[model samples]
Target: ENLYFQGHMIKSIPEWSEQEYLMLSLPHEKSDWNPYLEEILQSYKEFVKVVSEFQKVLLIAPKQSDFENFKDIKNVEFFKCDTNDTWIRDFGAIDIVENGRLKALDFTFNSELDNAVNSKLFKEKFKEELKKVDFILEGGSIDFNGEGVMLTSSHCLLNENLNKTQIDTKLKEIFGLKQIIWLENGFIDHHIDTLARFIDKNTIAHCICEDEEDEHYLPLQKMKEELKKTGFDLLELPIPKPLYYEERRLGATYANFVFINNALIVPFYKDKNDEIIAKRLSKALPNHKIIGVDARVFLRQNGSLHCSCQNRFKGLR
Candidate 1:
């Protein structure tokens, strides 16, 4: 399906008509974390409760040992996969369609930074599992409207880790997008999953920190300024200040909220700012229910809600 945006050839990717299921990678391997394994497991259980409350959730456990722990949930399905945690948003392929056929775009695994012991298997198996699109892209880094528009951060996509021009060319050929609105900067210490996310067709919620002395404040403000020029309705929310526990910076952001069929599941630290942000997000997305899960432990791993979950769009036939 060749599509033209301003006279340029862009492929028309299939739209997800219904958001039917959610996929999550359960934490099992020891390599993905350090020191606080028990706390991490508890957080994962809390997340499952939040997800199962709304829709069917498929939890991919790494080994048979973890299956018994998740069997009680009625709406949960347990599958086996070798992975550390729910970072599926990064490794999982982007779900889309071309010429009425469903497709998933996957990237070559970079094992040095992301220690995925079975990532090679994930790559090989995923190719056979879905109608694979040949490209290197992370689902967390790109946001789409289920139409022809995509939003992303240049800081992450343009890094030496991935091919920039190749991505742009593929975006034209695969997703049929008219433009890729590039945000110059993202969350201070975190990457795409913590900074910008699309909530609806014409709406976006961005992570911004207001502390003048904080490194993220200025650049985030600049992004907000640039976003205004695009004329899309915008919502600005503050990411909780990084907690200090022995001088390490934890990746935290309200921007990590996941938009499901009729609700938004947000991550919250039990800080003073939780209710304030929840109230605001509730107002912005009044039609959808807003639920928050305590993510203090998840924050220690440097990710939250959107990081733990992957949505299956009903558009795939």
Candidate 2:
């Protein structure tokens, strides 16, 4: 029995051939009291410092705001755009190339519940302007290795927000993916951004909580079991329950590492397990530097480094 349909062929999608810049949209409007607004700004600045240290950065700043404060930095370009927060990895487009031309895949906004105004920016503004493909896709929902494999969650792609068969067709048509490893197990309340992400082309790190006493243990364990059967290299990491914040389940996991040119920016909570996970990731990725950021404030808003940044492949502008 074929897992993928007959004639549903997978083609080759090229890996990014050159070092590309990162894009981040800043939070400017004061709709909801973003508890970490100040911290997010500082985080962006810190991120810029790191980005400059590694490679060039192209930031999409708030409309009319001056990036003169960041002008001294080399290999950095800033532009203007209207947005609510800096979590561009979700609402922003997933950059891809077709026929040697750059394009983007974007979705309708879903953060209005968190006080973000659904600009429908991709539909209203970027659809025709940016030469984007018409698909409701989120970057955080899918992980690709630039090979024949992709890892995603059924909870996110199979949900009502998106169509599964349509997505399957789009993936086949656009990215030329052969197998899609769909994990049904994910955080009970945190959605897709909290569960899993690709660390690099061949590596994937996911959240695995093992304390059966806690509510997340059983489901996450089942996820691991299902993943083992797929024959992909998996790295398991435990996430600590937040101390200061209770009931509000923070999206804390090692899967949210940001891949820069020569380093991996990993997010670390102030929990006791931070150092342990950092060491583990350092060992897992020895060739690249693994720098940890104290993301307590960002966690309060339910996002981290990878969630705040979006990557544009080279020649995709």
Candidate 3:
């Protein structure tokens, strides 16, 4: 119940801030998401090594031995937390700085049953103090630029657990948000990270669909209009060619990349335009190292690099 940062109230920190650790809820044999684990283990391994290179990693596994091979891996710490699945970006603690102090905002999970338990288990195991507000918003659904300005889709917030009026009120209370820019279209029914990412207070990088006949074309046009209305400089970070697994549209977005200490961990698929994402990020985020991670398996599971991890911001004393 007691948590503070140098006797300060948390003033919300954006994802772009310097971070202390990156966490992955490692999937083990007993994990509910274990069936999808092996398919993505190689990608996960590569990701772990890369992230650990920059900062400490919180590997929340059921057993420590599962990641023993990576024991020699520097800056990696293991936590034996009971987790049924991965996707820590959603279920893990959302470390937002409140009243100038770093505190966890524990939101309601997408699947309120098993997924919901992961947050409580993590808190119970780690015993980190959090604000404990249960807003039904995924970490991937929204974007913020450290300023009072926030970004999210209307469909996502409105279609989520609460009504729009309630959503607006709670969001303000949850993070001390002042201005929220809501896009009319939710982009394939959920999340704005798959559509846009704020590079800085003035610059915004987003997905572009130029085809007039394509399904996403109209949505992008409307999103573009809404984004333009925000008055932020728009940059192109291009999306991969849409590929569907049966009827489900795989969310292979470049914007889903995670922000680490001094780098932009971007995501990419084997698609043709994937090259542009690397080139674009390198040019835009000139001050930071831009690393491209293969998100084939991640996208196959309906997410990508940004979907896999969450940053633990170091409390500035």
Candidate 4:
């Protein structure tokens, strides 16, 4: 399928493609992260450390002084920007290939402080060319296979605030998608990254529950059936043990992994499944170094590696 915006044809870039930088907004005192700022900062530092070993990292901080301790990390560039939180994946621009060039798709994030970050970072600082889309979109809600197929959850895109047909049409046109596989459930806040992820253009690694009595078993099982119908090779990754912090059950998943150059960064809950899934991924993706990072702190905020950052492909120039 071909799509034209203005006069140029556009296409979506897959996450697995060579990335120029991994953009991340650090947590600060003014946001919900204030209470856990110390721990979260340490976690972010660790994540940055790992990511920089493989690719460049673009960090957004409230002030230049905030990065005093990170001077030792190489291949990192800092940008001063105020943020409501660290979930940049949802509010940042969704990059696309337009007429063989990179373009940012700026959608309404429906968040005041968080939404403002898009314009400040991508538009003001980076000076990226963007197409202002009217619809609301969260980057964490969809996953793409560089080959024109998009995997998402209807539970997210079909929210009461949106029209299904309009969303369908816009998604295809704006992203130049040929097929969209809308799953019935998102498993967490209606975001697909937490339920399943594309490990390759033709394979998906989805979460599954072994215990029949667990809350996620039935729904996840049903999701697996739908994924199988796509005719793609599907691998199963077990969900971590139910985690709770201050009476709130955290959203934990092995599916929310990130690809950076030659490495695959996977979230670990310190559960038994962490080692198991790492081995599974290592065997499946031999070229990538499967590294697991403790994600307990991130889970407290209901997000992981894939939720906290955005990928920028090399075409942005």
Using lDDT as the measure, the top candidate is: 4
- For residues 109-211, what per-residue lDDT tens digits would candidate 1 score against the true structure? 4444233423443454333344344455666777776557778778766662535776776665667777788777545523565776666677777877879
Clashes of each: 2, 0, 9, 0
Those runs of model 1 whose alpha carbons end farther than 4 Å from true positions after fitting are 1-17, 112-129, 160-166
lDDT of 4 at 125: 73
Query: Please, what are the lDDT tens digits per residue for candidate 4 over residues 79-137?
Result: 87776778889888888888887888888876676777777786777786667888878
By TM-score, how accurate is candidate 4?
0.95
Task: Count clashing residue pairs in model 4.
Answer: 0
Q: What TM-score would every model get versus the actual structure?
A: 0.85, 0.81, 0.88, 0.95
Q: Return whichever of 1 and 2 wins on lDDT.
A: 1
| C-alpha lDDT score of every prediction, in listed order | 0.68, 0.65, 0.74, 0.85
Lowest summed lDDT across 10 adjacent residues in model 2 is found at 113-122
Regions of candidate 2 where Cα sits further than 4 Å from its true position: 1-18, 29-36, 63-72, 107-129, 161-166, 188-193, 315-317
Cα-lDDT of candidate 2: 0.65
- Evaluation by lDDT, superior candidate among 2 and 4: 4
How far out, in Å, is residue 35 in model 1?
2.7
Clashing pairs in 3: 9-98, 9-99, 9-100, 9-101, 10-98, 10-99, 10-100, 10-101, 11-100
